[PDB]
Design a protein around this ligand. Structure first.
Ligand SMILES: Nc1ncnc2c1ncn2[C@@H]1O[C@H](COP(=O)(O)OP(=O)(O)O)[C@@H](O)[C@H]1O
Ligand SMILES: Nc1ncnc2c1ncn2[C@@H]1O[C@H](COP(=O)(O)OP(=O)(O)O)[C@@H](O)[C@H]1O
Ligand code: CFM
Ligand code: CLF
Ligand code: SF4
Ligand code: ALF
Ligand code: ALF
Ligand SMILES: [Ca+2]
Ligand SMILES: [Mg+2]
Ligand SMILES: [Mg+2]
Lengths: 522, 274, 478, 274
């Protein structure tokens, strides 16, 4: 039933007796589910070191990964350029998935097309799909540029994107001068970040390679900035803020902050502001290039140093105090712009926030995951706060990166009990938070299930999740937040401290029992 | 009745042509046979249809959109001796994924019955290279039960034969498909007969037959037909008829026992000089 | 309004399309006219989507793993291929279930073979085998496994059938090999057909020789209800209330056991025609189990169905059916009494999968709303025939509508509310048009049955008459 | 200097073997050459290394995990005449996706420089069948600039040659890769020379050379070496040296102009009888 005045949705609804009873009968009648005892048993088992060991012995099965295939990154990278339309040459299924994946994280429209290759397109090789697809795409959505990415299908069948595109132009399907940069993004290699890398490098090649003759380093008096796979509007904005705050001529390559934040005013802007093609063509003329997230911009680094001849600084993702300092100082050196008292004060304030909260932070053990750079940085900041990143997991991480983080950990007493895990999925982490239980875990929405699992063992075993990363689907607008620079640092610090206090208030909310420690002031 | 066979071997070793003529001899023996071409180039059926069939499963399916919209009548044609012929489509060289084509094609035939008839033999004329799981479709669970590898006393051809044998093993153990034997399509190598027999033994099989190299094969080939049809009295024709009988009477089906590269070299030195 | 104004609209939009695409698209845009029962009325469906026109379709994988196979609780489904499909698909669909996720139920999880380059080049057929063992070891309580082919698997030709049969025989576990390669087909549609066939061949037949199950004259089965937000449950409660016994729900709070039990049901109630009709027909021609379609969207439709269903049984059932209708009458009545006035005459446009676009029409009319246009992503002409008797004369119809099309159509039609998918939501919200997700119920409760109707009603009002809508334009502008 | 060439042709027509010997003649002419095997069977380099190389790009990469962890030193080996040899790995017949193997392999070499040297010639010995875009890797944007199709006066071999030509067209127009000519590896067909020349003209190319069928090729092959190394005074050796010069002096590079199946038949009838 339903009480019109106070309608109950799925949640309170299926808790009504008639419903409960129905499910009970359904279960006992046709589900043949394992006895509650067996269930409870196997569960307690999944929390033991014995289980965890077998769990880590996995060589084939991947459960609850902490990554996505290349094309996703290629698309995001594509969205960073002015009136550019992401075009994924391959199965249409992927594109639908990409769009929705981003739709849910940004709560914004996500324009992307596929040339819809099917059975015979795979067998015969979809060159026509490329031709018609490009023509149709331009004519219908009138984009200024089309960024081609790929699907495993197109990668297996070796569809020569370049050949196809070239022939597409030569056969009059699209104007010969229409910018159609491409990039091979095999789903089965690297991850989404690699896709971002490949896509960017391809675009960089497109507007540069040939025209390298008239280019001269530093002539434009700008500093190129490559964000890489970034899913926080605040992260793009903070970099641009600081740069402008210093009066540093810069050029953010792949800036979709606008596309991912179109104002709702009765009008739909498919495309929005982004990196102008001219900025890309002129990019080689820049003083240098700073890669905000170096660990997944490998191919781009080689192209920039090799072709653009830019001496890319060995800088870490500008996360946390130290790294942000290094970033600013490096930029300062390259541009000759002194760090304004504006930023100096901001740094001081963050330190002040750290000092005000060091009490609660000091000692808190965390488990975390996400992209290489993000994680690496998060770790550094955690260390600066006096916290312990015991379980550092980066599914899409590599041997060298692990070493880097290990060295970072070996540089601080707080990293003493930390352990970096590469090529490990969230199911592995689930075991880690059970066996060697941390205080909280920092990660994307996928971790909410780990917290569900942990709590199911017991309240004192519950490891609260702190949503920082990608993707965040169960929380509205967190994508606006910042993690980079002092600003991002301050936000993260605040978030952490308050998360700690929250759980404490809960734990001490028990009247008569634990409420004695329920302090008004903390 | 109903024996599904798969023909494999070194690229261009003559599998297609031999299969074409072989089947002709079978048809001449009153044996109803069907040949499923598994080469992107629909060349597995030319000598029977007396023309290069254009109605391939893949191309035809593409015309009707989904392969599901395709119907046997449109792709299955009978030629010489009432031998039914079907051709898995395929992309032109250097594009697409021919492997998938074969996969879909075989599945299509399977579902539309096709085999489901009164056929005495079904021959899968696979391409020489067989670069993927797709081209191994004919050697799957309930397809071909007996494979015949064509080769010559040429080092490369022999290597290919042995290499192909390796791949077969994976399927032999998982099912019931067995290697019937090797068919040596003579290419006038020195101790050819000895070489192939030596290899056959080493593998654990037999040399079903030695097909002499006779330009009659080409002369008939030019005129779009099998030696049998072109000249029944030709010596080569009797050779094919012999091979046919051999295949019909063959009861030897084994799981290939491959040899190491070194072992192959050793074999070549002992049986390939003088 | 008026087919003439509509036909002009269709023809106007088609103008941007290069001749080739223009020609094709025209065949998928049509003005409805009841009585017409075919494609005659310029409407062809289930065909290759035009490249570059940004369609909203999915892949065969989505058809199998996404909608049909994924929903099964006590069964582990392996997204076989590169990571991505599984990840993007992980817990996207709200096919609700009851189980201890991780120990006996696994829906929420994303099991994948995380294909890496070497697995393609050499074929991950061995990887799969090893994977399965790891699964049995780490998830003892699974009652079966299913490999969902992603594009790569189809191309490289991995003998997944064999791996399944061999490992299955060894481990004594049901392992179902599904060939739902994304490229195969034209949408999620074929994925359904494939998944159905997989069920038929690898699961259904399992209990044919077994006669231990105690059947009753009222044993029914709900097929084609994925319990989105609890949809199946809200439907089940009604059926059982009128004396029926729902032996199994297909892909709702479904277990492999009840699926195997299905061949013992006296009647199959098909909700989602497009996805389950295949297996329904098979169960009939084989087990002789008759099947009928039905609708639970809105009281009129629900009641209509409840009666038609009870009519297939004896009087005890029919009598109970009326008691049920009587019981819920004051409720849904109170619902319309409150909400209808707020939604009276409000025009709505839709676009969904391959059922809802026509099924929800009834519910809308029950709240006094008018569906001025609707369309499907993957529906075949089968559905379109049924659609025409539901749509009011001169309403717009579209198959595999391109993004650009939906936009322009909406521009002139100017509906008061639009119901479509996630990839659409924000686009129209930007335009200032109240949008409501008709795939995921916009994270809201069930819509099926009477209890679901109350929720559906509240939601429509909630959004359609939300104050946020008046504030789109800044006062300093006109 | 630096001429990247790609060799294609009917399966088993002799591309590998001819390429092996051809390169030997080039090396003998003081020409530094590298040969990239693009056949799943690492058989493109046996005659130069005097042994079947096991250090293939794919197998080696697998050992070190990611191909990214691989290093040239481990897969590149020099053999006879200092000819550098590399082999794209590949799965055994009937499994995996050999096509992808080639794609990754070529990309690997490209990135690790490899070509980036003082090489006079680079030869891509592709497999006969070429069933996908992967096997067309050598004919991509900045790879081979000149292709040479090997064939014989055999109907099937000619069809293959023409069929392969079709695929080439797609790449020729999108880049600069051109068909240098046809190399007829004699298989003793009646009017062989006339046939190939006829086809060559029809396609718009030339018959670079007519390699006589000589069992010496096999005798040398058996002993793991090229005819040049095995017997420099052998008549066949001079034939290869001739072909080498022909290739070196070749300036004729065209975009293949394929013919219809009917046109091929017509050609066969006119130049293949008597
Ligand atoms: N015994 C033979 N004598 C002469 N020519 C032959 C003989 N067998 C085959 N051929 C020729 O070899 C060439 C290739 O044969 P084909 O069957 O197409 O090779 P494959 O099976 O490996 O693809 C054609 O001219 C074919 O007629
Ligand atoms: N001119 C020739 N005379 C004799 N045998 C030859 C000649 N050319 C090639 N062969 C033999 O043909 C067989 C296959 O050669 P191969 O190069 O491996 O074919 P493919 O290039 O097409 O893979 C081997 O014995 C090879 O030595
Ligand atoms: S878009 Fe249903 S034919 Fe299918 S996930 Fe939704 S309108 Fe699907 S009713 Fe269903 S539970 Fe669906 S809402 Fe048929 S199952 S492929 Mo997207
Ligand atoms: S249409 Fe569908 S989702 Fe696409 S691939 Fe095909 S089955 Fe899968 Fe998978 S990993 Fe990512 S999303 Fe693909 S690019 Fe490959
Ligand atoms: S090697 Fe095979 S599976 Fe791979 S792309 Fe080629 S034909 Fe396809
Ligand atoms: F056409 Al083949 F081996 F049969 F090259
Ligand atoms: F090994 Al080949 F054509 F070179 F079969
Ligand atoms: Ca928004
Ligand atoms: Mg053949
Ligand atoms: Mg070769």
């Amino acid at each position: 039933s339903q009480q019109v005045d106070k309608i109950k949705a799925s949640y309170p609804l299926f808790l009504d007796q008639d419903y409960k009873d129905m499910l009970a009968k359904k279960r006992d009648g046709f589900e043949e589910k394992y006895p509650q005892d067996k269930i409870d048993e196997v569960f307690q088992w999944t929390t033991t070191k014995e289980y965890q060991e077998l769990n880590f012995q996995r060589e084939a099965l991947t459960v609850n990964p902490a990554k996505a295939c290349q094309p996703l990154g290629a698309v995001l990278c594509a969205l960073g350029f002015e009136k550019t339309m992401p075009y994924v040459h391959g199965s249409q299924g992927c594109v639908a998935y990409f769009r929705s994946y981003f739709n849910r994280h940004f709560r914004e429209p996500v324009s992307c097309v596929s040339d819809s290759m099917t059975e015979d397109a795979a067998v015969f090789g979809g060159q026509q799909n490329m031709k018609d697809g490009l023509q149709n795409c331009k004519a219908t959505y009138k984009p200024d540029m089309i960024a081609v990415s790929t699907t495993c299908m197109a990668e297996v069948i070796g569809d020569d994107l370049n050949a196809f595109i070239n022939n597409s132009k030569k056969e009059g399907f699209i104007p010969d001068e229409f910018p159609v940069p491409f990039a091979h993004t095999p789903s089965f290699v690297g991850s989404h970040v690699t896709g971002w890398d490949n896509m960017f490098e391809g675009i960089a090649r497109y507007f540069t390679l040939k025209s390298m003759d008239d280019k001269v380093v530093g002539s434009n008096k700008k500093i190129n900035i490559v964000p890489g796979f970034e899913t926080y509007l605040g992260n793009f904005r903070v970099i641009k803020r600081m740069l402008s705050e210093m009066g540093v001529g810069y050029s953010l390559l792949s800036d979709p902050e606008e596309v991912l934040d179109t104002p709702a005013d009765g009008q739909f802007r498919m495309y929005a502001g982004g990196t102008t093609q001219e900025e890309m063509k002129d990019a080689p003329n820049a003083l240098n290039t700073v890669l905000l997230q170096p660990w997944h911009l490998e191919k781009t680094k080689k192209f920039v140093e090799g072709t653009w001849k830019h001496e890319v600084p060995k800088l870490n993702i500008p996360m946390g105090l130290d790294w942000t300092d290094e970033f600013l100082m490096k930029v300062s050196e390259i541009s000759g712009q002194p760090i304004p008292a504006s930023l100096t004060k901001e740094r001081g304030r963050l330190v002040d926030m750290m000092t005000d909260s060091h009490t609660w932070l000091h000692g808190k053990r965390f488990a975390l995951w996400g992209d290489p750079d993000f994680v690496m940085g998060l770790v550094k900041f955690l260390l600066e706060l006096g916290c312990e990143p015991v379980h550092i997991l980066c599914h899409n991480g590599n041997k060298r990166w692990k070493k880097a983080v290990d060295a970072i950990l070996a540089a601080s007493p707080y990293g003493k009990n930390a352990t970096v895990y590469i090529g490990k999925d969230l199911w592995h982490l689930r075991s880690l938070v059970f066996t060697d239980k941390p205080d909280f875990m920092i990660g994307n929405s996928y971790g909410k299930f780990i917290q569900r699992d942990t709590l199911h063992k017991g309240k004192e075993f519950e490891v609260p999740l702190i949503r920082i990363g990608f993707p965040i689907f169960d929380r509205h607008h967190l994508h606006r937040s910042t993690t980079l620079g002092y600003e991002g640092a301050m936000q993260i610090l605040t978030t952490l401290v308050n998360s700690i206090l929250e759980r404490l208030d809960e734990e001490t909310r028990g009247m008569q029992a634990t409420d004695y420690n329920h302090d008004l002031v903390r | 009745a109903m024996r599904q066979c798969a023909i494999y071997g070194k690229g261009g070793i003559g599998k297609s042509t031999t299969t074409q003529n072989l089947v002709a001899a079978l048809a001449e023996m009153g044996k109803k046979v069907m040949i499923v071409g598994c080469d992107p180039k629909a060349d597995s059926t030319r000598l029977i249809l007396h023309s290069k069939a254009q109605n391939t499963i893949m191309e035809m399916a593409a015309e009707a959109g989904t392969v599901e919209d395709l119907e046997l009548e449109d792709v299955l044609k009978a030629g010489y001796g009432g031998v039914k012929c079907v051709e898995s489509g395929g992309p032109e060289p250097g594009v697409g994924c021919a492997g998938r084509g074969v996969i879909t094609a075989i599945n299509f035939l399977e579902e539309e019955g096709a085999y489901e008839d009164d056929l005495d033999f079904v021959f899968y004329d696979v391409l020489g290279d067989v670069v993927c799981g797709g081209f191994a479709m004919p050697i799957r669970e309930n397809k071909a039960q007996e494979i015949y590898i064509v080769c010559s006393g040429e080092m490369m051809a022999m290597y290919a034969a042995n290499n192909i044998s390796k791949g077969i093993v994976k399927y032999a153990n998982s099912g019931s498909v067995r290697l019937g034997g090797l068919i040596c399509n003579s290419r006038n190598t020195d101790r050819e007969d000895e070489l192939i027999i030596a290899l056959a033994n080493k593998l654990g099989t037999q040399m079903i037959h030695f097909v002499p190299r006779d330009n009659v094969v080409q002369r008939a080939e030019i005129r779009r037909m099998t030696v049998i049809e072109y000249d029944p009295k030709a010596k080569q024709a009797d050779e094919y008829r012999a091979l046919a009988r051999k295949v019909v009477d063959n009861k030897l089906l084994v799981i290939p026992n491959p040899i190491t590269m070194d072992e192959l070299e050793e074999l070549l030195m002992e049986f390939g000089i003088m | 309004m008026s087919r003439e104004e509509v036909e002009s609209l269709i023809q106007e939009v088609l103008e941007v399309y290069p001749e080739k695409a223009r020609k094709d698209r025209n065949k998928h845009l049509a003005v409805n006219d009841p009585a017409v029962t075919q494609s005659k009325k310029c409407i062809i469906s289930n065909k290759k989507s035009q490249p570059g026109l940004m369609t909203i379709r999915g892949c065969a994988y989505a058809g199998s793993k996404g909608v049909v196979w994924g929903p099964i609780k006590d069964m582990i489904h392996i997204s076989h291929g590169p990571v991505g499909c599984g990840q993007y698909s992980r817990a996207g669909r709200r096919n609700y279930y009851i189980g201890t996720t991780g120990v006996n139920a696994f829906v929420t999880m994303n099991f994948t073979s995380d294909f890496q380059e070497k697995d393609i080049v050499f074929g991950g057929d061995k990887k799969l085998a090893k994977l399965i063992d790891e699964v049995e070891t780490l998830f003892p309580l699974n009652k079966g496994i299913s490999v969902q082919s992603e594009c790569p698997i189809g191309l490289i030709g991995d003998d997944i059938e064999s791996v399944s049969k061999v490992k299955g025989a060894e481990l004594s576990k049901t392992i179902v090999p599904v060939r739902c390669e994304g490229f195969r087909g034209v949408s999620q549609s074929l994925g359904h057909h494939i998944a159905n066939d997989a069920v038929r061949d690898w699961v259904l037949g399992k209990r044919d020789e077994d006669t231990t199950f105690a059947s009753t004259p009222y044993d029914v089965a709900i097929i084609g209800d994925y319990n989105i937000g609890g949809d199946a449950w809200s439907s089940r409660i009604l059926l059982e209330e009128m004396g029926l016994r729902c032996v199994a729900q297909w892909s709702g709070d479904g277990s492999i056991s009840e699926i195997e039990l299905t061949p013992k049901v006296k009647l199959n109630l098909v909700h989602c025609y497009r996805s389950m009709n295949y297996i329904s027909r098979h169960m009939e021609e084989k087990y002789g189990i008759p099947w009928m379609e039905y609708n639970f969207f809105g009281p009129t439709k629900t009641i209509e169905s409840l009666r038609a269903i009870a009519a297939k049984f004896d009087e005890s059932i029919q009598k109970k059916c009326e008691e049920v209708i009587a019981k819920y009458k004051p409720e849904w009545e109170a619902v319309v009494a409150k909400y209808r006035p707020r939604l009276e005459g409000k025009r709505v446009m839709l676009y969904i999968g391959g059922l809802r676009p026509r099924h929800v029409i009834g519910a809308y009319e029950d709240l006094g709303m008018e569906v001025v246009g609707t369309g499907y992503e993957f529906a075949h002409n089968d559905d379109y025939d049924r659609t025409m008797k539901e749509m009011g004369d001169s309403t717009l119809l579209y198959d595999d509508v391109t993004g650009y099309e939906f936009e322009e159509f909406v521009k002139r039609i100017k509906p008061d509310l639009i119901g479509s998918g996630i990839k659409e939501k924000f686009i129209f919200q930007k335009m200032g048009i109240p949008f409501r997700e008709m795939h995921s119920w916009d994270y809201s409760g069930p819509y099926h049955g009477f209890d679901g109707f109350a929720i559906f009603a509240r939601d429509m009002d909630m959004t359609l008459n939300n104050p946020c809508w008046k504030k789109l334009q800044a006062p300093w502008e006109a």
